[PDB]
């Protein structure tokens, strides 16, 4: 209890991620049976995650209300950050440092995955798990997770929108609701709200570096053909 109503409406938009887990792993079980590098596997997992993210956005209150051009602009401004945030929150939920949990729910030792990555993605994963640690020490919960997801989707820095005022209002509403919820449910940890907000630019920097890395790796022919991932990358 002690949850503002707007945050319950936002929680109503969360997918039955058990079923999403199952469907993604079924898709991959089927695809691999018809030589796939670990990097390509991660690319295809991120592709399915992107499909699910699009289904979550077009399920959102406020978001459906937007012209499809505005939806496109917001989604292509924030898809990478949403991916990184979902990864970080997954790690926070499972909270077994020294392991990485995939959108499949599959746990794999951080060692064996990092061994296969270059310096760029290794640095980005290290930073992501530092963020995981800090958010765990703050007791990042699901309510704050969805509030952050909506703050990232409805970004103030997306220009050339027709209904920028809708995005401004959504930002104001979600910011106020998260303030109220965090400080009322965690008097334990005053300034937890400002800290949560301070973590967003860092997630964003990680997201942008990763986005450009995968873009350049695609231009070099090392990103296996992932339809929506590559489509988001090119634009």
């Amino acid at each position: 209890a002690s949850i503002p109503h707007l945050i319950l409406e936002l929680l109503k938009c969360e997918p039955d991620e058990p079923q999403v887990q199952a469907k993604i792993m079924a898709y991959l079980q089927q695809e691999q049976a018809n030589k796939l590098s670990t990097f390509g596997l991660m690319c295809k997992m991120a592709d399915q995650t992107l499909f699910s993210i699009v289904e979550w956005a077009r399920s959102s209150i406020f978001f459906r209300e937007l012209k499809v051009d505005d939806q496109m602009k917001l989604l292509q401004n924030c898809w990478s950050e949403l991916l990184i945030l979902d990864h970080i929150y997954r790690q926070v939920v499972h909270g077994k440092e020294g392991s990485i949990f995939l959108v499949t729910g599959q746990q794999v030792d951080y060692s064996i995955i990092a061994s296969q990555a270059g310096a760029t993605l290794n640095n980005l994963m290290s930073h992501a798990q530092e963020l995981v640690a800090k958010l765990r020490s703050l007791q990042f919960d699901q309510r704050e997770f969805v509030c952050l997801k909506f703050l990232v989707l409805f970004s103030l820095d997306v220009k050339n929108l027709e209904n920028f005022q809708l995005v401004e209002g959504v930002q104001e509403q979600v910011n106020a609701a998260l303030l109220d919820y965090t400080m009322c449910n965690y008097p334990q940890q005053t300034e937890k709200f400002g800290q949560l907000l301070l973590r967003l630019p860092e997630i964003r920097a990680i997201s942008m570096q990763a986005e450009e890395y995968l873009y350049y790796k695609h231009l070099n022919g090392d990103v296996p053909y992932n339809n929506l991932l590559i489509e988001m990358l090119h634009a």
Binding site: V68, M72, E231, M232
Partner: peptide, 10 residues
Amino acid sequence: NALLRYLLDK
């Protein structure tokens, strides 16, 4: 990005 548009209109 025609794929994203088809996803959002479907």
